[PDB]
């Protein structure tokens, strides 16, 4: 689709069988979801944002469906304020910025 | 223009006639510039995201040019790690996400 930016660019995702709302975020390197359970092994990681650094769990090679498009890649889980789809998965679904 | 998302979407902006690099961030409501000593009246504000909040200075009706496209609006200044263009200005230059 074409998504304008008058409102936050929120979409529905499906992950581990569950539906959630996430923000399409060109300002994020990585995809970061609010605390949740995901299957499989994970590693501790840290990431930075506007306010400083937080600890997250890194899960590799996780399938996610984003606004109807399939992606499989790294998902971080931790105390983010909102679910964020970052560039690692935006590139998989063919997203660009246009003006 | 079309900006792909393989790399951080950094573009050149002009503020006060001077050039800076900034990140096009669909996950930011507002635009925040790295610390700079801008003239004019301002008001204190807190902005938040991953890692918590930071203190910034809010300036109003500041002209900016983003990749040659002119904009005017609210510009925040503080200890962000990178200059960030948010939706308040992305909408003015007709930016969309496309997939």
């Amino acid at each position: 689709p074409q998504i304008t930016l008058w409102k936050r660019p929120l979409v529905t995702i499906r992950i581990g069988g569950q539906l959630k709302e996430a923000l399409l975020n060109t300002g994020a390197d990585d995809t970061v979801l609010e605390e949740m359970n995901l299957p499989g092994k994970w590693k501790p990681k840290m990431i930075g944002g506007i306010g400083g650094f937080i600890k997250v769990r890194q899960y590799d090679q996780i399938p996610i469906e984003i606004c109807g498009h399939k992606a499989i890649g790294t998902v971080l889980v931790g105390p983010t304020p909102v679910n964020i789809i970052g560039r690692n998965l935006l590139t998989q679904i063919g997203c660009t910025l246009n003006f | 223009p079309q900006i792909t998302l393989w790399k951080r979407p950094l573009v050149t902006i002009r503020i006060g006639g001077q050039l800076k690099e900034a990140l096009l961030n669909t996950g930011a409501d507002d635009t925040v510039l790295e610390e700079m000593n801008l003239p004019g009246k301002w008001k204190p504000k807190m902005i938040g995201g991953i890692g918590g909040f930071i203190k910034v200075r809010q300036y109003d009706q500041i002209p900016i040019e983003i990749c040659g496209h002119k904009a005017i609006g609210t510009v925040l200044v503080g200890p962000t790690p990178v200059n960030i263009i948010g939706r308040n200005l992305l909408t003015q230059i007709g930016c969309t996400l496309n997939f």
Binding site: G27, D30, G48, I50, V82, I84 | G27, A28, G49
Partner: peptide, 10 residues
């Protein structure tokens, strides 16, 4: 309310 979701690796 929180509104700037910049994020950088690690």
């Amino acid at each position: 309310r929180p509104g700037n979701f910049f994020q950088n690796r690690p």
